[PDB]
DNA sequence: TTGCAACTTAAGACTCACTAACCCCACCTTATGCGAATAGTGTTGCTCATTTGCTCAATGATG
């Protein structure tokens, strides 16, 4: 797990990094997910942005949640409320059981919030 | 003779008019503007209860 300083510290570069970014002042050749989010609306942001996008590179979806709340900087509420309206029926051992339904919205909060500690926790070193 | 109870007539207000069924259609709108207040609703960090999977723990049944 990262610690706070940690925390705030990779924050605020996503922070000057998002807001470097959804500015507009990046190039097609990073991503075409980062395309992509261009698609939908200085050496800092570019060398972050390798970073972010050598790491994420790989999921994609998470990649673009994480472009949705530091480019976009959207609230995690609506986040996770737009990702239980898209929910599919799945297996859960839930508090109800093992039948297969549509989760609830405070899981879909945690996914949404161990999807950003381990998005942050995977890139932090790098 | 005169008042007075008593009888008579008339005027007026209220109630009230069979039982069941089927079909159709018609049904009810015009100041602006501004600030203040409030309700709502949005976000987020943080609980609490509840089902399963699973492990210990023993005890008589069995090898």
Redesign the pocket.
């Known amino acids: 797990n990262l610690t706070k300083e940690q925390h705030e510290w990779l924050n605020g570069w996503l922070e000057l990094w998002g807001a470097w970014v959804y500015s507009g002042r990046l190039e097609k050749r990073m991503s075409s997910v980062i395309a992509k989010f261009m698609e939908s609306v200085d050496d800092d942001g570019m060398l972050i942005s390798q970073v972010v996008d050598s790491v994420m590179y790989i999921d994609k979806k998470a990649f673009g949640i994480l472009l949705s709340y530091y480019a976009h900087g959207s609230?995690?509420?609506?986040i996770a409320?737009y990702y239980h309206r898209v929910a599919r029926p799945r297996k859960m051992?839930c508090?109800?059981?093992?039948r297969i339904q549509k989760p609830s919205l405070?899981t879909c909060?945690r996914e949404v919030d161990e999807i950003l500690n381990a998005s942050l926790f995977m890139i932090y070193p790098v």
Do not use: C, D, E
Request: net charge positive; hydrophobic share 25%.
């Open positions: 609230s995690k509420h609506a409320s051992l508090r109800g059981g093992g405070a909060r």
